[PDB]
Amino acid sequence: AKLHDYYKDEVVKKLMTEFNYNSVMQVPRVEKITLNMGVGEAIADKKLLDNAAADLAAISGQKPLITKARKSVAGFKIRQGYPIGCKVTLRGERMWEFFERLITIAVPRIRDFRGLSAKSFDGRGNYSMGVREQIIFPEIDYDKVDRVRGLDITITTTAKSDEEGRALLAAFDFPFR
Template identity: 50%
Template sequence: MATVPYLKKYYLEKVVPELIKSRGYKNIHQVPNLKKIVLNSAFKAEADKGHMAEVVKDMTKLSGQKPIITKASKSVAAFKVREGMPLGCVVTLRGARMWEFYLRLTAVALPMIRDFRGTSNRLDGRGNYSLGIADHTIFPETQADGSQRANIGMDVIIVTSAQTDDEGRELLRLLGMPFRRSSAADAAAATATAAAKA
């Protein structure tokens, strides 16, 4: 019998009751959940086969599964793109791998960013969240072999079952996403601190 990932267990035992209490859901199936996480990385325009192989290798290490190579569907002369040319790679995570990646992202990788002050708290209007990562080496598994390689940027798209951005934001926050505090929240905290000192 497979073990339940730590974060999924935390979601079921802590996050679901908290969301039911704060949002007044009548049914457990109304509670928003993580559906999938998509990792997407583009190859450099002048990328050779060696660089592409490195990107695929590192994306495999990050996700635990082999990425799909995305190719150009048509030629675009202005961008020097030919039909069938490899453009990047994409991985879709579901189930246990999704929960494990989310935990590594929020608890290990993001805090490794120099001068990290939190992630943007803007969602896409449908409760989904996109995050750009400029340097993939914030994930420890990419540093395991100790080899020097070029930084690989990637997009992380977190798809939830939330109906609104507010629901999605609260779900991700309760699951540990280190959102940047809004200026209004900072002002309120500063006022509370000043009042406490007076």
């Protein structure tokens, strides 16, 4: 809750000035962070899912919700009901502490990190990014793992416009460009 403490005193004072909001409730705020691993190759065996869910449980310290197919499609050879991915929703204090560890540790540990995109805000403020490799988090031991996974991070916020979420992450020095 270090950044949550950092949110409540200086980010709110910053955004109220540069947007001239009438109320303090009118400010944006982050709401949840969703950690998906679409593991489409787990239809061969459960153990790839069972270890990828084990890896994402180490990144964010929650047991992941194993997601399933909403319907059946034949291009991917899946039926409605097959376990096909895993997610973690992060809210409250656990949202901020992962968000602290993300932009301070794991984003510098990206190989050939050169910035993010400012064109990834889904028209309505909600930001989504995808990492290539789970080794950028220091939770994963390099010798103990064998397979390079990938996950994607989705920050869902209360910003109405598209730029207001872009200004919100910039108050947390989110490395756009």
